[PDB]
Design a protein around this ligand. Sequence first.
Ligand code: CA
Lengths: 313, 311
Amino acid sequence: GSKNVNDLITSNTTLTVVDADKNNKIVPAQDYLALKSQIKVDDKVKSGDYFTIKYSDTVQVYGLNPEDIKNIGDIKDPNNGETIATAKHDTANNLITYTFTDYVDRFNSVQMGINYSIYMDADTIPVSKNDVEFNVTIGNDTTKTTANIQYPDYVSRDNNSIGSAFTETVSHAGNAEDPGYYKQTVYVNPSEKSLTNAKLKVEAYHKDYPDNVGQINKDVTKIKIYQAPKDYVLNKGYDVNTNQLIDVTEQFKDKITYGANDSVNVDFGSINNSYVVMVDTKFEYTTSESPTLVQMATLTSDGNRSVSTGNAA
Amino acid sequence: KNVNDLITSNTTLTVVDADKNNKIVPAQDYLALKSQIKVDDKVKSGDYFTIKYSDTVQVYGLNPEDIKNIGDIKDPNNGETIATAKHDTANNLITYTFTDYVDRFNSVQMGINYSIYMDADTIPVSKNDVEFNVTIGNDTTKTTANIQYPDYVSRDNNSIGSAFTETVSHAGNAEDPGYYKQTVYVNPSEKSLTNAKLKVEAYHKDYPDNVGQINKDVTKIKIYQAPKDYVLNKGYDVNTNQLIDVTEQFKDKITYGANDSVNVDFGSINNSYVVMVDTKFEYTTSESPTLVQMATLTSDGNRSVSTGNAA
Ligand SMILES: [Ca+2]
């Protein structure tokens, strides 16, 4: 436990929006931010001293897996493999703290490189917006960039509309005791149409993916359903504030039916509101470090063609 | 004008086990709907009421033209039409529009006595307590049945199943005698077959008056491959979107032969396949013609397995 030495570091930093699929649309789910910095450390800095990296509310350091927050870890000298500083995260407070090792007592003119991929946090970005700012502060020095966030349209066909995203995916490769879990959120009727005989079918099945490690059944699957008030603006990044919505789950205990081929059905009957369905379920066993996962959601209603959305890993 | 609020009914919805086994199956059994409906005097000509039904119910079986059989409601005493019927099967709806019968008569009441059917689309496997319901005006009648599909047919490592899915004959029509479809499940047990071949034949020695027909001019075949462990709909109501269309892969594997036969060479397989056969009826004069079409799977090191369907 030594001193905060943010004052004793300087840096040369870029923060760049990467259009990962190069489609001229910046979307938190698909695209990311590249943080690159060369940091110089004053010779006065000593073992046990620490510096911080902070980041804006529009930045997070993990994606779908809140375990992977370590390709952001200890800083090492690539010429000798020695650790220069050890990393500890406080993601809840948008903070990383690096504590210098004995390296800074032994070496003078200490320099460190970081090359991180970090992500856009949709919490404060509920709709498409121009010039949204993302920033990182290394020591006391802040680097900013901006992007025009353009979320894709919901999937619509006639009067049916739907949207979906995985929100959390943690697969444990080769672990038989706990292969892991994943969560999917489905927005039903975001267009707020009056529908009759509306039904949602969620399925962890697709003919292009026999490799699928998704799973849906009465045994491992948990569902919650929320009703949004009329004209409520749903977060397009699927970052849901469930406390602003009405938990209507108990009203659906007799409207949820499991079916063949990893299917589940939800009978909505006559609706004119938007609904948020959150599906929590367990992965199958895999040895893959990057397993195939596909889960589909389809809304049908009377007088309309069906509409389908899905998400894949 | 919608007068569902002005109709009152006493209704029964009954499962009839029509082949007198002890099992209820969409392909062999049906639903008897019976109702006496009362109509308030305030109802006038041009007013209408509706009958709806669950997604587990359809109003025709093998022949979609049989929606004709659920028609206008008539007074059996004088033969006058009380209401005219229009179907919207896509929306599980029947609409009945009152004639001026309701202007000339008071204390109007109507009877319906319909045979309707179980829709296998949402019933892919044996399940207990499956609900079927019909709504007359605003009143719903529910009944429940335990669906128990039969086993696929098996001998050694060969397995097969088949069903007619649509049968439309037009008696006395020579421009358009009609068509019928049969779906065959090949290898539903997912075994490893070598030199696997399917023979489908509109031929049975015992039915010389068969109106079935299989040849290159009239027959069309589609073939789908199911992924490993896929659960096929036991009612032969298949979702082709969930299967891989491999019809093109078989363009040179399908050969027609004598006595209304067609052969499909599958070679070495370990998946289940769905074969859809669309073909034309022979000209007939009967409203209840004889149709028989057999399906036989063969493979090396196994004895043949045969099944088929007949009307
Ligand atoms: Ca029966």
